Amino acid sequence: NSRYTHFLTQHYDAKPQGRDDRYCESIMRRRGLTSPCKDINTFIHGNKRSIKAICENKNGNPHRENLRISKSSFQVTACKLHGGSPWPPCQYRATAGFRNVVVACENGLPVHLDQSIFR
């Protein structure tokens, strides 16, 4: 369904090279996330099947009001907007990490990433 494919476009990058500032600047443009510039956007790396599994008891627990939190940790990169303007050119600073993630699930699929844990 459409919301799951959208989640993948905004939040999934299987095998990144360097996860530096330039990686952020370039993937944000590539994925169509720069008019206007998103203030922060996080990408998850690794196995697509582990991500889907957060929606079942296999790799997730219930979390807060309507969310799920993963049991396994993932490689992630947060891209944060540097500077005052929300209009291109968008300068980004990258922060690489390794921890569990929080999603919303609908009909068995992740449709939303909770980004409050990367702020």
Side-chain angles (χ1 to χ4, degrees), residues 11-14 16 18-28 30-37 39-48 50-51 53-56 59-63 65-79 81:
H11 299 298
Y12 177 69
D13 181 24
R19 286 146 61 196
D20 67 343
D21 295 358
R22 276 126 122 283
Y23 161 83
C24 277
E25 291 171 7
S26 142
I27 194 161
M28 289 302 281
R30 205 152 70 234
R31 300 295 179 84
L33 274 26
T34 56
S35 49
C37 314
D39 60 324
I40 187 182
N41 192 74
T42 303
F43 291 93
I44 302 169
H45 314 299
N47 191 308
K48 211 144 98 187
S50 318
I51 298 169
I54 305 167
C55 297
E56 339 149 357
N59 196 33
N61 286 157
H63 181 71
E65 285 106 63
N66 38 10
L67 272 12
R68 323 250 314 153
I69 188 158
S70 73
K71 284 164 166 181
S72 70
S73 297
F74 294 85
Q75 293 288 342
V76 300
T77 309
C79 300
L81 191 61

Coordinates of all heavy atoms in Angstrom, one line a residue, residues 11-82, unseen atoms left out:
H11 N 12.5 7.2 4.6 CA 13.2 6.7 5.8 C 14.1 5.5 5.6 O 14.6 5.0 6.7 CB 12.2 6.5 6.9 CG 11.5 7.7 7.3 ND1 12.2 8.8 7.8 CD2 10.2 8.1 7.3 CE1 11.3 9.8 8.1 NE2 10.1 9.3 7.8
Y12 N 14.2 4.9 4.4 CA 15.0 3.7 4.3 C 16.1 3.8 3.2 O 15.9 4.3 2.1 CB 14.1 2.5 3.9 CG 14.9 1.1 3.6 CD1 15.5 0.5 4.6 CD2 14.9 0.6 2.3 CE1 16.2 -0.7 4.4 CE2 15.6 -0.6 2.1 CZ 16.2 -1.3 3.2 OH 16.9 -2.5 3.0
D13 N 17.4 3.5 3.6 CA 18.5 3.4 2.6 C 19.4 2.2 2.9 O 20.1 2.3 3.9 CB 19.3 4.8 2.6 CG 20.4 4.8 1.6 OD1 20.4 4.1 0.6 OD2 21.4 5.5 1.7
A14 N 19.3 1.2 2.1 CA 19.8 -0.1 2.4 C 21.2 -0.2 2.8 O 21.6 -0.8 3.8 CB 19.4 -1.1 1.3
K15 N 22.1 0.3 1.9 CA 23.5 0.2 2.1 C 24.2 1.5 1.7 O 24.6 1.7 0.5 CB 24.1 -1.0 1.2
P16 N 24.3 2.4 2.7 CA 25.0 3.7 2.4 C 26.5 3.6 2.4 O 27.0 2.6 3.0 CB 24.6 4.5 3.6 CG 24.5 3.5 4.7 CD 23.9 2.3 4.1
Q17 N 27.2 4.5 1.7 CA 28.6 4.5 1.8 C 29.2 5.2 3.0 O 29.1 4.7 4.1
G18 N 29.7 6.5 2.8 CA 30.1 7.3 3.9 C 28.8 7.9 4.5 O 27.9 8.2 3.7
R19 N 28.7 8.1 5.8 CA 27.5 8.7 6.3 C 27.9 10.1 6.9 O 27.7 10.3 8.1 CB 26.8 7.8 7.3 CG 26.0 6.6 6.7 CD 26.0 5.3 7.5 NE 25.4 5.5 8.8 CZ 25.5 4.6 9.8 NH1 26.3 3.5 9.7 NH2 24.9 4.8 11.0
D20 N 28.4 10.9 6.0 CA 28.9 12.3 6.4 C 27.9 13.3 6.0 O 26.9 13.0 5.4 CB 30.3 12.5 5.8 CG 30.4 12.6 4.3 OD1 29.4 12.1 3.6 OD2 31.4 13.1 3.6
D21 N 28.3 14.6 6.2 CA 27.4 15.7 5.8 C 27.0 15.7 4.3 O 25.8 15.8 4.0 CB 28.0 17.1 6.1 CG 28.3 17.3 7.6 OD1 27.9 16.5 8.4 OD2 28.8 18.4 8.0
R22 N 27.9 15.5 3.5 CA 27.6 15.4 2.0 C 26.7 14.2 1.7 O 25.9 14.4 0.7 CB 28.9 15.3 1.2 CG 29.5 16.6 0.9 CD 31.0 16.8 1.3 NE 31.9 17.1 0.2 CZ 32.3 16.3 -0.7 NH1 31.9 15.0 -0.7 NH2 33.1 16.7 -1.7
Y23 N 26.7 13.1 2.4 CA 25.7 12.1 2.2 C 24.3 12.6 2.4 O 23.4 12.4 1.6 CB 26.0 10.8 3.0 CG 24.8 9.9 3.2 CD1 24.5 8.9 2.2 CD2 24.0 9.9 4.4 CE1 23.4 8.0 2.4 CE2 22.9 9.0 4.5 CZ 22.6 8.1 3.5 OH 21.5 7.2 3.7
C24 N 24.1 13.3 3.6 CA 22.8 13.9 3.9 C 22.4 14.9 2.8 O 21.3 14.7 2.3 CB 22.9 14.6 5.2 SG 22.7 13.4 6.6
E25 N 23.2 15.8 2.4 CA 22.8 16.8 1.4 C 22.4 16.2 0.1 O 21.4 16.6 -0.5 CB 24.0 17.8 1.2 CG 24.2 18.7 2.4 CD 25.4 19.6 2.3 OE1 26.1 19.6 1.3 OE2 25.8 20.2 3.4
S26 N 23.0 15.1 -0.2 CA 22.8 14.5 -1.5 C 21.5 13.6 -1.5 O 20.7 13.6 -2.4 CB 24.0 13.8 -2.0 OG 23.7 12.6 -2.7
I27 N 21.4 12.8 -0.4 CA 20.2 11.9 -0.4 C 18.8 12.7 -0.2 O 17.8 12.2 -0.6 CB 20.3 10.7 0.7 CG1 19.2 9.7 0.5 CG2 20.3 11.3 2.1 CD1 19.5 8.3 1.1
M28 N 18.9 13.8 0.6 CA 17.8 14.6 0.8 C 17.2 15.2 -0.5 O 16.0 15.2 -0.8 CB 18.1 15.8 1.8 CG 18.3 15.3 3.2 SD 16.8 14.4 3.9 CE 15.7 15.9 4.3
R29 N 18.1 15.6 -1.4 CA 17.8 16.1 -2.8 C 17.2 15.0 -3.6 O 16.1 15.1 -4.2 CB 19.0 16.6 -3.5 CG 19.5 17.9 -3.0 CD 20.7 18.5 -3.9 NE 21.6 19.2 -3.1
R30 N 17.9 13.8 -3.6 CA 17.6 12.6 -4.4 C 16.1 12.2 -4.0 O 15.4 11.8 -4.9 CB 18.6 11.5 -4.0 CG 18.7 10.4 -5.1 CD 20.1 9.8 -5.1 NE 20.4 9.0 -3.9 CZ 21.5 9.1 -3.1 NH1 22.4 10.0 -3.4 NH2 21.6 8.3 -2.1
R31 N 15.8 12.2 -2.7 CA 14.5 11.7 -2.3 C 13.4 12.7 -2.3 O 12.2 12.4 -1.9 CB 14.6 11.0 -0.9 CG 15.5 9.8 -0.8 CD 15.1 8.6 -1.7 NE 16.1 7.5 -1.6 CZ 16.1 6.6 -0.6 NH1 15.1 6.6 0.3 NH2 17.0 5.6 -0.6
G32 N 13.6 13.9 -2.8 CA 12.6 14.9 -3.0 C 12.1 15.6 -1.7 O 11.0 15.9 -1.6
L33 N 13.1 15.8 -0.8 CA 12.8 16.3 0.5 C 13.3 17.7 0.8 O 13.6 18.1 1.9 CB 13.3 15.4 1.6 CG 12.5 14.1 2.0 CD1 11.5 13.6 1.0 CD2 13.5 13.0 2.5
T34 N 13.5 18.6 -0.3 CA 14.1 19.9 -0.2 C 13.3 21.1 -0.7 O 13.9 22.1 -0.9 CB 15.5 19.9 -0.9 OG1 15.3 19.5 -2.3 CG2 16.5 18.9 -0.3
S35 N 12.0 21.0 -0.9 CA 11.2 22.2 -1.1 C 9.8 22.0 -0.4 O 8.9 21.4 -1.0 CB 11.0 22.6 -2.6 OG 10.7 21.5 -3.4
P36 N 9.7 22.5 0.8 CA 10.9 23.1 1.5 C 11.8 22.1 2.2 O 11.4 20.9 2.4 CB 10.1 24.0 2.6 CG 8.9 23.2 2.9 CD 8.5 22.4 1.6
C37 N 13.0 22.5 2.7 CA 13.9 21.7 3.4 C 13.3 21.1 4.7 O 12.9 21.9 5.6 CB 15.1 22.5 3.8 SG 15.9 23.5 2.5
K38 N 13.3 19.8 4.9 CA 12.9 19.2 6.2 C 13.9 19.6 7.3 O 15.1 19.5 7.0 CB 12.7 17.7 6.0 CG 11.5 17.1 6.6 CD 10.2 17.4 5.8 CE 10.0 16.3 4.8
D39 N 13.4 20.0 8.4 CA 14.2 20.4 9.6 C 15.1 19.2 10.1 O 16.3 19.4 10.5 CB 13.4 21.0 10.7 CG 12.3 20.0 11.2 OD1 11.7 19.2 10.4 OD2 12.0 20.0 12.4
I40 N 14.6 18.0 10.1 CA 15.3 16.8 10.5 C 14.7 15.6 9.8 O 13.5 15.5 9.7 CB 15.4 16.5 12.0 CG1 16.4 15.4 12.3 CG2 14.0 16.3 12.6 CD1 16.5 15.0 13.8
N41 N 15.5 14.7 9.2 CA 15.0 13.5 8.6 C 16.0 12.3 8.9 O 17.2 12.5 8.7 CB 14.8 13.7 7.1 CG 14.0 12.5 6.5 OD1 12.8 12.4 6.7 ND2 14.7 11.7 5.7
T42 N 15.5 11.2 9.4 CA 16.3 10.1 9.7 C 16.1 8.9 8.8 O 15.0 8.6 8.4 CB 16.0 9.6 11.2 OG1 16.2 10.7 12.1 CG2 17.0 8.5 11.7
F43 N 17.3 8.3 8.3 CA 17.3 7.1 7.5 C 17.7 5.9 8.3 O 18.6 6.0 9.1 CB 18.2 7.4 6.3 CG 17.7 8.4 5.3 CD1 18.1 9.7 5.4 CD2 16.9 8.0 4.3 CE1 17.7 10.7 4.5 CE2 16.4 9.0 3.4 CZ 16.8 10.3 3.5
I44 N 17.0 4.8 8.0 CA 17.3 3.5 8.6 C 18.1 2.6 7.6 O 17.7 2.7 6.4 CB 16.0 2.8 9.1 CG1 15.2 3.6 10.0 CG2 16.3 1.4 9.7 CD1 13.8 3.1 10.3
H45 N 19.1 1.9 8.0 CA 19.9 1.1 7.1 C 19.8 -0.4 7.5 O 19.3 -0.7 8.5 CB 21.4 1.5 7.1 CG 21.6 3.0 7.0 ND1 21.2 3.7 5.9 CD2 22.1 3.9 7.9 CE1 21.5 5.0 6.1 NE2 22.0 5.1 7.3
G46 N 20.1 -1.3 6.6 CA 20.1 -2.7 6.8 C 19.0 -3.4 6.1 O 18.6 -3.1 4.9
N47 N 18.4 -4.4 6.8 CA 17.5 -5.4 6.2 C 16.0 -4.9 6.2 O 15.5 -4.7 7.3 CB 17.6 -6.7 7.0 CG 16.9 -7.9 6.4 OD1 15.8 -7.8 6.1 ND2 17.7 -9.0 6.3
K48 N 15.4 -4.9 5.1 CA 14.0 -4.5 5.0 C 13.1 -5.4 5.8 O 12.1 -4.9 6.4 CB 13.5 -4.5 3.5 CG 12.5 -3.5 3.2 CD 12.7 -2.9 1.8 CE 11.8 -3.6 0.8 NZ 12.1 -3.2 -0.6
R49 N 13.4 -6.7 5.9 CA 12.5 -7.6 6.6 C 12.5 -7.4 8.2 O 11.5 -7.7 8.8 CB 12.8 -9.1 6.3
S50 N 13.6 -7.0 8.7 CA 13.7 -6.7 10.2 C 12.8 -5.5 10.5 O 12.2 -5.5 11.6 CB 15.1 -6.3 10.6 OG 16.1 -7.2 10.0
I51 N 12.7 -4.5 9.6 CA 11.9 -3.3 9.8 C 10.4 -3.7 9.8 O 9.7 -3.2 10.7 CB 12.2 -2.3 8.7 CG1 13.7 -1.8 8.8 CG2 11.3 -1.1 8.7 CD1 14.2 -1.0 7.7
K52 N 9.9 -4.4 8.8 CA 8.5 -4.9 8.8 C 8.2 -5.7 10.0 O 7.0 -5.6 10.5 CB 8.3 -5.8 7.6 CG 8.0 -5.1 6.3 CD 7.2 -6.1 5.4 CE 7.5 -6.0 4.0
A53 N 9.1 -6.5 10.5 CA 8.9 -7.3 11.7 C 8.7 -6.6 13.0 O 8.2 -7.2 14.0 CB 10.1 -8.2 11.9
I54 N 8.9 -5.3 13.1 CA 8.6 -4.4 14.2 C 7.1 -4.4 14.5 O 6.7 -4.2 15.6 CB 9.2 -3.0 14.1 CG1 10.7 -3.0 13.8 CG2 8.8 -2.1 15.3 CD1 11.2 -1.6 13.3
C55 N 6.4 -4.7 13.4 CA 4.9 -4.6 13.5 C 4.3 -5.9 14.1 O 3.1 -5.9 14.4 CB 4.3 -4.3 12.1 SG 4.7 -2.7 11.5
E56 N 5.1 -6.9 14.3 CA 4.7 -8.2 15.0 C 5.5 -8.4 16.2 O 6.4 -7.7 16.5 CB 4.8 -9.4 14.0 CG 4.9 -9.1 12.6 CD 5.8 -10.1 11.8 OE1 6.4 -11.0 12.4 OE2 5.9 -10.0 10.6
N57 N 5.1 -9.4 17.0 CA 5.8 -9.7 18.3 C 7.2 -10.2 18.1 O 8.0 -10.1 19.1 CB 4.9 -10.7 19.2
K58 N 7.5 -10.6 16.9 CA 8.9 -11.0 16.5 C 9.9 -10.0 16.8 O 11.0 -10.3 17.4 CB 8.9 -11.4 15.1
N59 N 9.7 -8.7 16.4 CA 10.7 -7.7 16.6 C 10.2 -6.3 17.2 O 10.8 -5.3 17.0 CB 11.5 -7.5 15.4 CG 12.8 -6.7 15.6 OD1 13.5 -6.8 16.7 ND2 13.3 -5.9 14.6
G60 N 9.1 -6.4 17.9 CA 8.5 -5.2 18.5 C 7.7 -5.3 19.8 O 7.1 -6.4 20.1
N61 N 7.6 -4.3 20.6 CA 6.7 -4.1 21.8 C 5.7 -3.0 21.5 O 6.1 -2.0 20.8 CB 7.5 -3.8 23.0 CG 8.3 -5.0 23.6 OD1 9.3 -4.8 24.3 ND2 7.9 -6.2 23.3
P62 N 4.6 -3.0 22.2 CA 3.7 -1.8 22.2 C 4.4 -0.6 22.9 O 5.2 -0.8 23.9 CB 2.5 -2.2 23.0 CG 2.5 -3.7 23.0 CD 4.0 -4.1 22.9
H63 N 4.2 0.6 22.4 CA 4.9 1.8 22.9 C 4.0 3.0 23.0 O 3.3 3.3 22.0 CB 6.1 2.1 22.0 CG 6.9 3.2 22.4 ND1 7.8 3.2 23.5 CD2 7.1 4.4 21.8 CE1 8.4 4.3 23.6 NE2 8.0 5.1 22.6
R64 N 3.9 3.6 24.2 CA 3.1 4.8 24.4 C 1.7 4.7 23.9 O 1.1 3.6 24.2 CB 3.8 6.1 23.8 CG 5.0 6.6 24.5
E65 N 1.1 5.6 23.2 CA -0.3 5.6 22.9 C -0.7 4.6 21.8 O -1.5 3.8 21.9 CB -0.8 7.0 22.7 CG -1.0 7.8 23.9 CD 0.1 8.9 24.1 OE1 0.1 9.8 23.2 OE2 0.9 8.8 25.0
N66 N 0.0 4.8 20.6 CA -0.4 4.1 19.4 C 0.8 3.6 18.6 O 0.7 3.3 17.4 CB -1.3 5.0 18.6 CG -0.8 6.5 18.6 OD1 0.3 6.8 19.1 ND2 -1.6 7.4 18.1
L67 N 2.0 3.4 19.2 CA 3.2 3.2 18.6 C 3.8 1.8 18.9 O 3.4 1.1 19.8 CB 4.2 4.3 19.0 CG 4.4 5.6 18.2 CD1 3.3 6.0 17.2 CD2 4.6 6.8 19.2
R68 N 4.9 1.4 18.1 CA 5.7 0.2 18.5 C 7.1 0.5 18.5 O 7.6 1.4 17.8 CB 5.5 -0.9 17.4 CG 4.1 -1.1 16.9 CD 3.3 -2.3 17.4 NE 4.1 -3.5 17.3 CZ 3.9 -4.6 18.1 NH1 3.0 -4.6 19.0 NH2 4.7 -5.7 18.0
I69 N 7.9 -0.1 19.4 CA 9.3 0.1 19.5 C 10.0 -1.2 19.2 O 9.6 -2.3 19.7 CB 9.7 0.6 21.0 CG1 11.2 1.0 21.1 CG2 9.3 -0.4 22.1 CD1 11.5 2.0 22.2
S70 N 11.1 -1.2 18.4 CA 11.8 -2.4 18.0 C 12.6 -3.1 19.1 O 13.1 -2.4 20.0 CB 12.7 -2.1 16.8 OG 13.9 -1.4 17.2
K71 N 12.8 -4.4 19.0 CA 13.6 -5.1 20.0 C 15.1 -5.1 19.6 O 16.0 -4.9 20.4 CB 13.1 -6.6 20.1 CG 11.9 -6.7 20.9 CD 11.2 -8.0 20.7 CE 10.1 -8.3 21.7 NZ 9.5 -9.7 21.5
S72 N 15.4 -5.2 18.3 CA 16.7 -5.1 17.8 C 17.2 -3.6 17.5 O 16.3 -2.8 17.3 CB 16.9 -5.9 16.5 OG 16.2 -5.3 15.4
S73 N 18.5 -3.4 17.5 CA 19.0 -2.1 17.2 C 19.3 -2.0 15.7 O 19.6 -3.0 15.1 CB 20.3 -1.9 18.0 OG 20.1 -1.9 19.3
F74 N 19.2 -0.8 15.1 CA 19.5 -0.6 13.7 C 20.6 0.5 13.5 O 20.7 1.4 14.3 CB 18.3 -0.1 12.9 CG 17.2 -1.1 12.9 CD1 16.3 -1.2 13.9 CD2 17.0 -1.9 11.7 CE1 15.2 -2.2 13.8 CE2 16.0 -2.9 11.7 CZ 15.1 -3.0 12.7
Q75 N 21.4 0.4 12.5 CA 22.2 1.5 12.0 C 21.3 2.6 11.4 O 20.4 2.3 10.6 CB 23.2 1.0 10.9 CG 24.3 0.1 11.5 CD 25.4 0.8 12.4 OE1 25.5 2.0 12.3 NE2 26.1 0.0 13.1
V76 N 21.5 3.8 11.9 CA 20.7 5.0 11.4 C 21.6 6.2 11.1 O 22.7 6.3 11.7 CB 19.6 5.4 12.4 CG1 18.6 4.3 12.7 CG2 20.2 5.8 13.7
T77 N 21.1 7.1 10.3 CA 21.7 8.4 10.1 C 20.7 9.5 10.2 O 19.7 9.5 9.5 CB 22.4 8.5 8.7 OG1 23.2 7.4 8.5 CG2 23.4 9.7 8.6
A78 N 20.9 10.4 11.1 CA 20.0 11.6 11.2 C 20.6 12.8 10.4 O 21.8 13.2 10.6 CB 19.7 12.0 12.6
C79 N 19.9 13.4 9.6 CA 20.3 14.6 8.8 C 19.5 15.8 9.4 O 18.3 15.9 9.3 CB 19.9 14.4 7.3 SG 20.7 12.9 6.5
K80 N 20.2 16.8 10.0 CA 19.6 17.9 10.6 C 20.0 19.2 9.8 O 21.2 19.4 9.4 CB 20.1 18.1 12.0
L81 N 19.0 20.0 9.5 CA 19.1 21.3 8.8 C 19.9 22.3 9.5 O 19.7 22.7 10.7 CB 17.7 21.9 8.5 CG 17.6 23.0 7.6 CD1 18.1 22.7 6.2 CD2 16.1 23.5 7.5
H82 N 21.0 22.8 8.9 CA 21.8 23.9 9.4 C 21.4 25.2 8.8 O 21.2 25.3 7.6 CB 23.3 23.6 9.1 CG 24.3 24.3 10.0

